[PDB]
Design a protein around this ligand. Structure first.
Ligand SMILES: *[C@@H]1O[C@H](CO)[C@@H](O)[C@H](O)[C@H]1NC(C)=O
Ligand SMILES: *[C@@H]1O[C@H](CO)[C@@H](O)[C@H](O)[C@H]1NC(C)=O
Ligand SMILES: *[C@@H]1O[C@H](CO)[C@@H](O)[C@H](O)[C@H]1NC(C)=O
Ligand SMILES: *[C@@H]1O[C@H](CO)[C@@H](O)[C@H](O)[C@H]1NC(C)=O
Lengths: 49, 297, 284, 49
């Protein structure tokens, strides 16, 4: 579950702060949504198991 | 429960120099796209907010980064690529764009990070005894690979009749034109573009933004910015041996967990501020309104 | 100083297969007790090593160099990407007391054996002199770092007594170099042990390298162009993945391949240097 | 019709002759006519004169 944080699920960067400090607001939002989606899946998978 | 930061610590190198953009932008005569000017930029401070705010530009387009806040980040391995092009830049020079330039003149990466800055130049000597030439609109084989440049193009054949020079062919591949055609046509082709390529990684920064630094702390939760790397936690002294070529650390999984300070070269460990779950221990509200609170771990 | 000599001894290359060496780990520090996988092209633990005597390559600019000579016969500056034209540029090495600069430039020198290198009149045999470099600024650029000339390991302890390792990467517009000099006990070939190298330079130099040669020309004046019995070893890098073990100062103490032996593959998939009895599916 | 002893004069506009083997079309029109000897730049879109 921890390692999955590094996956970078289609986003430009696995680090949330890196996205926020590099892209503009709406530009970051579309990248953040990808990290959120992947992390939601990772948590849901963990709990299910 | 989460401990909040008390101070914001911004740290950048001891450097006081300035970035030589003007030296590329308009200091001298411009090179053709094939013979594009590749200038390495390092050991300088670059304020890109000037170019953003400045006039006399047709396009200020960034990829991978915002057009703003470019002055808030440090970059390494910075290169400025200068070209002379037609105003038809859109759909010719771009990441993932199969333009004529992209395929056979100058190839830009699909994962390119940086800024493309372009402007027109209708107040030059191009119409007054100008020696402007070196336009290209012919192909050779396949793509040129990103950021590569040819130095030959002496012999070109692409088909049958292998005469090593026949008129019934795509002759004069290099130097296809020079047709500035002063005052006439839809664009005279005065357009100049500079592409700023940035790398953003663990490697030491070579170009800094126009930002001042502040002091350090040893035992309290703070916000921080180390060469563009941001986050929060407690900054403490490290007792581990980071070699001279090592700027960042890493835990068993991820997160730097330690950084090298850009001005003192000392190593600081980064410990996430204290936090934990908060739960309420209560009897029924139909019995009592007094509760106890547990802060977990 | 163009020699164009034929007065040389031709010696066939020699080969060996035990080679558990060659490491250029990333700068980012992995605290301790870390078992971390890595990608990029490295040198296989049992690669077939070639001992060469000024034999032309074809390095792909991705390989590792070794030296086993005494300091008095230390190999001198080597050149990458040299062709028989002015089209390419390269120059990397200077000494700490020859008053010369690492000025990267085109090759317009004696072909093939551009010697130039000598040591000092104190040898009373080789004749003291220097390189004859004639670069042209016209249509030529110059980029270099003049600092890295302190690669000198002093002392006379051991029974060999010292060996040197250097690895050179292509690499994507940079010329990264890692190296280390170590003491060694009495050996007949590369030691059956493990070590790792540290980076010296990045060199953001965008030059396409397709060829490579090293140089040592300590020829005496006793007869013809005869030098000492120097030799060196080289190998090549390949795009294979590896498991690196840190222990415990942020340094590499061991490593395992994936392509050589199914057992090594198993170790990598299990993230372990120890494998228990059982059946493990490592791949398909 | 692209490269031989015959068809010594060959020009293309819009569609490259090196791509035609990989391109499909419909209702292709063949216009057969004779042009005066002074044919220099008499077939271009940028037609003057
Ligand atoms: C910056 O440079 C000065 C010398 O001008 C040096 O004394 C100082 O230690 C360096 N670093 C910092 C944090 O000031
Ligand atoms: C609250 O406690 C009183 C005690 O007399 C009881 O009568 C009442 O039903 C309780 N109400 C609820 C909602 O539990
Ligand atoms: C290395 O490869 C060459 C290929 O010709 C072979 O002759 C030689 O025996 C090999 N050396 C070893 C030690 O396997
Ligand atoms: C780590 O370095 C120290 C010297 O700084 C040394 O004494 C210690 O033995 C090293 N640790 C290991 C495992 O070699």
């Amino acid at each position: 579950l921890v390692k999955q944080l590094s996956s970078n699920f289609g986003a430009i960067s696995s680090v949330l702060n890196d996205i926020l400090s590099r892209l503009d607001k709406p530009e970051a939002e579309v990248q953040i949504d990808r990290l959120i989606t992947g992390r939601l899946q990772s948590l849901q998978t963990y709990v299910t198991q | 429960f989460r401990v909040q930061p008390t101070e914001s610590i911004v740290r950048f190198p001891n450097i006081t120099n300035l970035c030589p953009f003007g030296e590329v932008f308009n200091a001298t005569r411009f090179a053709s796209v094939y013979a594009w000017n590749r200038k390495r930029i390092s050991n300088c401070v670059a304020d890109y907010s000037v170019l953003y705010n400045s006039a006399s530009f047709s396009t200020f387009k960034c990829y991978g980064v915002s057009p703003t806040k470019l002055n808030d980040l440090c970059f390494t391995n910075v290169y400025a690529d200068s070209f002379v092009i037609r105003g038809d830049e859109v759909r010719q020079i771009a990441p993932g764009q199969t333009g004529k330039i992209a395929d056979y003149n100058y190839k830009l990466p699909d994962d390119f990070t940086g800024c493309v800055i372009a402007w027109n130049s209708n107040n030059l000597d191009s119409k007054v005894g100008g020696n402007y030439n070196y336009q290209y609109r012919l192909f050779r084989k396949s793509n040129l690979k990103p950021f590569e440049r040819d130095i030959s193009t002496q012999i070109y054949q692409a088909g049958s009749t292998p005469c090593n020079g026949v008129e019934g062919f795509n002759c004069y591949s290099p130097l296809q034109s020079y047709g500035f055609q002063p005052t006439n046509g839809v664009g005279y082709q005065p357009y100049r573009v500079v592409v700023l390529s940035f790398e953003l990684l663990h490697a030491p920064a070579t170009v800094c933004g126009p930002k001042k630094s502040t002091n350090l702390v040893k035992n309290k939760c703070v916000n921080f910015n180390f060469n563009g790397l941001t986050g929060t936690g407690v900054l403490t002294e490290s007792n581990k041996k980071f070699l001279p070529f090592q700027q960042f650390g890493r835990d068993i999984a991820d997160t730097t967990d330690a950084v090298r300070d850009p001005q003192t070269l000392e190593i600081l460990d980064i410990t996430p501020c204290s936090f934990g779950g908060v739960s309420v221990i209560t009897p029924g509200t139909n019995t009592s309104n007094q509760v106890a609170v547990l802060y977990q771990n | 100083q163009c020699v164009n000599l034929t007065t040389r001894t031709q010696l066939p290359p020699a080969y060996t297969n035990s080679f558990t060496r060659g490491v250029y780990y990333p700068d980012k520090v992995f605290r301790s007790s870390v078992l971390h996988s890595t990608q990029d092209l490295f040198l296989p633990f049992f690669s077939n090593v070639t001992k060469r005597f000024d034999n032309p390559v074809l390095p792909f600019n991705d390989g590792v160099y070794f030296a086993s000579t005494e300091k008095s016969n230390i190999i001198r500056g080597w050149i990458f990407g040299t062709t028989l034209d002015s089209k390419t540029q390269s120059l990397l090495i200077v000494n700490n007391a020859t008053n010369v600069v690492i000025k990267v430039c085109e090759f317009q020198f004696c072909n093939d054996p551009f010697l130039g290198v000598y040591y000092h009149k104190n040898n009373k045999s080789w004749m003291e002199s220097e390189f004859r470099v004639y670069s042209s600024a016209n249509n030529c650029t110059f980029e270099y770092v003049s600092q890295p000339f302190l690669m000198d390991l002093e002392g006379k302890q051991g029974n060999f007594k010292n060996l040197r390792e250097f690895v050179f990467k292509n690499i994507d517009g940079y010329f990264k170099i890692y190296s280390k000099h170590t003491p060694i006990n009495l050996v007949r070939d590369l030691p059956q042990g493990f070590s790792a190298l540290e980076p010296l330079v990045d060199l953001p130099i965008g030059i396409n390298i397709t060829r490579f040669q090293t140089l040592l020309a300590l020829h005496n004046s006793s007869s013809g162009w005869t030098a000492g019995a120097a030799a060196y070893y080289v190998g090549y890098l390949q795009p294979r993945t590896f498991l690196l073990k840190y222990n415990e100062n942020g340094t590499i103490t061991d490593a395992v391949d994936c392509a050589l032996d199914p057992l090594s593959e198993t170790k990598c998939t299990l993230k372990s240097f120890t494998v228990e009895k059982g059946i493990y599916q490592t791949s398909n």
